[PDB]
Amino acid sequence: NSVQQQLEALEKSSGGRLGVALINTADNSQILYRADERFAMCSTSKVMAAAAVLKQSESDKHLLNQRVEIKKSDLVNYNPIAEKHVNGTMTLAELGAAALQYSDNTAMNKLIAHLGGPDKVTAFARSLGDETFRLDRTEPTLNTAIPGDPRDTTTPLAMAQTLKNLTLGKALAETQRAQLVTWLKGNTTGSASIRAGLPKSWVVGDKTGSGDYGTTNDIAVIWPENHAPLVLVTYFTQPEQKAENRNDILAAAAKIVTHGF
């Protein structure tokens, strides 16, 4: 059975909608499945927010050390790093780390509020040639992931193309590009997702995302031991609002598309 058939068989038994975009930078060949369809990004959009601040930091050498006050009121839901700093301060770099590596929502909203709001993250994405990405809301409401809702969505292919540009490509200056990579490699939240479908020795940098309707996402950059890097986006969402998240589906989708490398 072909990869396309394995992914269609995986989607069918899953009770949800599967979106996959793999980019093999060796020859820029692509494995695509619903790759032009819109999915709620959920926390995977946190990569774009941080990246935007890294871009700013190219022309402002004092930015990433700029201190930001964390008060109790700033605490939305789920603030694993930010809660440890209430009545204190975090630098933008520490916020960019917390947002990516622990999926901290306080950190995400601080980055958004610094940039000037969700529209500004959208604007940044556009400047990278990404005409699909759109961030509309702050945390946690950006995770409603309602079917048919265009807010806070993008497509697997577009997000794979942008992630490639951000981590391996021309989007950021070298120093900034290297920091984003370092941040993604040190993710702590992606063990049961794409990483679970790959060889253990492979190096991986990823940002997971989950929301309502069982929306379960993960976007990764993969460095094999004897091959060029791979960029993989795996998106998955389900019909019913209180569906269970399904990281195992992302691990399964990762294993299917990499069987050959």
Ligand SMILES: *[B]([O])([O])C1=[C]C2=C([C]=[C][C]=[C]2)S1
């Ligand atoms: B993300 O997509 O990984 C997350 C979204 C929310 C979290 C906690 C509380 C509300 C939304 S983590």
